[PDB]
């Protein structure tokens, strides 16, 4: 059945914590080769998708795809009664209505195990074929974060605009405007500080800044961010993690 | 693996596939593509990831993954 063993319960807690800044519920789609954590924000605008690969786990086993719909409160509650250094194990059978977390102190032979009733969640419906993308830029994730923190102070919305050689971020407050214009560039001294642009279609979208403010927290995890926008399609922000992929899908606002 | 790399240069109309060591200056590659086009090297610009590839630089320091496309356009005043 389902048997996923994290080497450190804190690894799992870190995940759960990340999610608790944006969402209340997560769906854990367990497939044979890893888990895909999926959640939609309360206002139904943001979509987060985390891919914990298999080598992320200490021992993974999934005999059949299960979906584990969890409440992040409950889950956090259970995680308290466990030590960050214990191994954590999720245990479920082929058609669950309940899960079991199994904390294990190896150096003492303590074993603790709590149940958790699962629930039904609509982020089961994340069947995006990822679609396809007018433009695709990538940049140092903190650089992207800096920009966002600055212009989110000016306004409640930010505008991104791509052109053959220009990414232009803009915000207009009734207290001041401001704007950044960045240009694809490379350097041999610091290759990872590079800006890559692949344009096929000039794009011009606007996003709620609060969401962008969540999205940017991903930067702790990955020192680069990929952005893929398309005319009338949700924007993709994504961060490479060693054993997986964090992805946000954000709806632009219409005029 | 780490050995070489394969790259495509497309001028939108035609293509050419290239194998080079990740450490080799792209100058040659660019010239190879130009002559096979019957164009002057300086009459076209090679774009990659939105930057304007420089004859001096190599694929390695450009973050080039196997089967990357390089875009050759006429040297003009932007698209």
């Amino acid at each position: 059945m389902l048997e996923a063993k994290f080497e450190e319960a804190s690894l799992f807690k870190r995940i759960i914590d990340g999610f608790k800044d944006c969402v209340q519920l997560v769906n854990f789609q367990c497939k044979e080769d890893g888990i895909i954590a999926q959640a939609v924000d309360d206002s139904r605008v943001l979509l987060v998708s985390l891919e914990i690969g298999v080598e992320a786990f200490q021992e993974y086993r999934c005999d059949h795809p299960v979906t584990l719909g969890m409440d992040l409160t409950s889950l956090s509650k259970i995680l308290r009664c466990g030590n960050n250094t214990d191994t954590l194990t999720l245990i479920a059978d082929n058609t669950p209505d309940s899960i079991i977390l199994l904390f294990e102190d190896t150096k003492k032979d303590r074993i603790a195990e709590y149940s958790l009733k699962l629930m039904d969640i609509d982020a089961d419906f994340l069947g995006i074929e990822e679609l396809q993308y007018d433009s695709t830029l990538s940049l140092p994730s903190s650089e992207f974060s800096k920009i966002v923190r600055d212009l989110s102070q000016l306004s409640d919305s930010i505008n991104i605009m791509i052109t053959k050689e220009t990414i232009k971020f803009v915000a207009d407050g009734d207290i001041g405007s401001g704007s950044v214009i960045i240009k694809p560039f490379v350097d041999m001294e610091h290759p990872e500080t590079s800006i890559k642009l692949e344009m096929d279609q000039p794009v011009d979208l606007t996003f709620g800044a609060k969401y962008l403010l969540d999205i940017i927290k991903g930067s702790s995890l990955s020192d680069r961010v990929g952005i893929r926008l398309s005319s009338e399609a949700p924007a993709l922000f994504q961060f490479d993690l060693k054993s997986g992929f964090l992805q946000f899908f954000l709806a632009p606002k219409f005029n | 693996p780490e050995t070489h790399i394969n790259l495509k240069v497309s001028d939108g109309s035609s293509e050419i596939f290239f194998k080079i060591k990740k450490t080799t200056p792209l100058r040659r590659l660019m010239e190879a593509f130009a002559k096979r086009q019957g164009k002057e090297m300086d009459s076209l610009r090679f774009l990659y990831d939105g930057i304007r590839i420089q004859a001096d630089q190599t694929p390695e320091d450009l973050d080039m993954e196997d089967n990357d496309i390089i875009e050759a356009h006429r040297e003009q005043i932007g698209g």
Binding site: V40, S43, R44, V45, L46, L47, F125, I128, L131, G208, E232, A233, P234, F249, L250, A251, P252, K253, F254 | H4, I16, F17, F18, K19, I20, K21, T24, R28, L29, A32, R36
Partner: peptide, 21 residues
Amino acid sequence: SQMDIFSQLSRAKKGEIIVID
């Protein structure tokens, strides 16, 4: 005004080789 992420996913979806070493 902001739009819903799903009603936007709905509306949206609906021979030479030269060698140099």
